[model samples]
Target: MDSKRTRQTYTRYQTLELEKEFHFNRYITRRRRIDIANALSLSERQIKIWFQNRRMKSKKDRTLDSSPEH
Candidate 1:
């Protein structure tokens, strides 16, 4: 297994709002993901992972909501 880097941890609420706003009003000032990674001082891959996980969670929620209850 690859050794993990020391990580910067963000509150769930913080990342949640960032993801939500990015979904709505993207790339207002600088390049989309690059600016986020730069401002947050996080790797671009971290920013990408954050958005990917956020979208996956939303999709799971939608699927559960649409499923019939037992």
Candidate 2:
């Protein structure tokens, strides 16, 4: 088995900040992405992953609200 540590353990500060941004804009630009990366003291690559996962969550929530069959 391959073992690797995650870059960072997400915190409430980062979570809320990212959540607020996500609430405002589900998709963000590279400039804004990096802005948050520094603002949250997180890596740009990590931010990208966060947004990717967040986007999927929004989509799944929408589907749950409409069909919710899955």
Candidate 3:
């Protein structure tokens, strides 16, 4: 078994900032990612991953909202 693993944790402020940006723009440019990365002290890769996950979540939420109640 591979024993190498890592978990990324975000602070409350960080989560709030990211959530605001995610809602404002689901798709962001690399330049914007870099700016956010510096502001949040996170790597570009991390920001990219966060946006990707958020985008999927947003899409899922939209689909669920449009579905009829059972």
Model 2, range 1-70, lDDT digits (tens) per residue? 8733334568887788888888877777888887777766677788778878986675545676478754
The residue pairs in collision within model 1 are none
Q: Report the alpha-carbon TM-score of model 3 versus the true structure.
A: 0.68
Candidate of highest lDDT: 2
Alpha-carbon lDDT, every model:
0.57, 0.74, 0.72
* Candidate scoring better on TM-score of 1 and 2: 2
Name the weakest run of 10 consecutive residues (lDDT summed) in model 3.
1-10
lDDT per residue for candidate 3 within 17-52, as digits (tens), equals 888888777877788877877766667777789888
Ten contiguous residues with the weakest lDDT in model 1? 25-34
Writing each residue's lDDT as its tens digit, candidate 1 over 1-70 gives: 8843324566676577566656765433336566655655555666666656765565534656578332
> What's the CA error at residue 10 for candidate 1, in Å?
1.4
Task: Give the residue spans of candidate 3 off by over 4 A.
Answer: 1-8, 58-62, 65-70
TM-score of each: 0.49, 0.68, 0.68
TM-score of 2: 0.68
Candidate 1, residue 53: CA error in Å? 1.1
Model 3, residue 16: C-alpha shift (Å) = 0.6
lDDT at position 50, candidate 3: 85
